[model samples]
Target: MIKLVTFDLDDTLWDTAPAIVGAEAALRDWLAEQAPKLGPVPVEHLWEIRSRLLDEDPSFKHRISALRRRVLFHALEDAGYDSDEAQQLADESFEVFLHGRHQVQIFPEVQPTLEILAKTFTLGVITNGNADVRRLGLADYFAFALCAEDLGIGKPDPAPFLEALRRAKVDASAAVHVGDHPSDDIAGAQQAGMRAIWYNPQGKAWDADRLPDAEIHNLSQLPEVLARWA
Candidate 1:
């Protein structure tokens, strides 16, 4: 029986793209009024700055939040603002972006499913992105939340998966992970000896060498699936 269930935040609990898209718009709207000189930077320009930062310090890969802030700062600076002004604007802009990032539309069944599962299983979160459950007002449901920013490691490596098992004080055999990504969530959990359930809402084809132990297209379907194991 599974005693612990870990989840990925980005595409698992909610759609990731809309949150990011809204965040970028929020940041741009802030910059337009506050830092007129550094009006909305082009997407290509943002990626260029990100590429350079990643190249200079590969550690940025693990710090998604910081990476975005630094990218914004450089975008401001490159657009002719002084370092001090750029830093300040970037800081405030990041706060705005973060607030907007948490503006996620969690699936209709997510809370109900979490409530049902939480009664019998330890629920935790492991995410590569900067999404925070606490900010989204879903923190109470989780036993713990781990992210790449804190661990300096992301999924598909088994560290986060193993850490979840360790935190829950359960053996990997009694833990399972649920997420959308084939390799990052499914493969990562299995690699750490935990069961993996793919949350494939899109109904996409699986091209992975190793298949998920289970698959789900909706959060409402989760309880029935877990009940089978019980």
Candidate 2:
């Protein structure tokens, strides 16, 4: 009965930690080259400042790019750059991170699994992260992508999940969402009346009270899982 299949991007499609680490390293290296005076600003320091900024203003959670820019701006200004100069440098510096972010290493079975699934159901994406499928060259596999930045809200809010179902023009019962987060993917999809498949490849324990409609440890297991659902 599933007419649509939506997925979360970050940890669901690939391991994100390494990508982020690489991105931060790239950004730091770029900054060091461009602003030599700002010597030795460790990647962890920038992330720490970003974390503090997020804690200071919860609203900044909606615009990750803005939040990152603000962090970079502050970092540059602290290193002696003026406001105008810092702002320009921050904007330029962010492109480095953005480029490195999309250099994701997708799981081995992901493309094949998605290829099969795409043929059977309308494929879509619902993500809180800024990873763009089109930029990642996976656009052909997806019908549409709904991002938190585009909508000013994220998963576990039911907005993105509901929007995905709406765009696919399918009742919640006729679609399934796949993601790694228990609350954001499973709980949110359930709240929107759609089924959810937990992609727990790491063998994480399910701490949530409500269970997902199904679970799979690898992308290769997804087809059989969906077939069982069918």
Say which candidate scores most in lDDT. 1
What TM-score would each prediction reach against the true structure?
0.95, 0.92
Among all windows of ten consecutive residues in candidate 2, which has the lowest summed lDDT?
A: 35-44
Query: What does candidate 1's lDDT look like per residue over 122-164, in tens digits?
Result: 9999999888888887999999999988998899887888888
lDDT of 2 by residue, 1-230 (tens): 88999999899999999999999889888988997877897668888889899899876787788889899899889889999999999999899899999999998888989999988999999988889998986999999999988988888898888888888899999989999999888899999998899999889888778899998899888788888767
lDDT of 2: 0.89
Best by TM-score: 1
lDDT agreement of model 1 with the native? 0.89
- C-alpha lDDT score of every prediction, in listed order: 0.89, 0.89
For model 2, what is the error of residue 37's alpha carbon versus the real structure, in angstroms, after optimal superposition? 3.1
Error of model 2, residue 138, in angstroms: 0.4
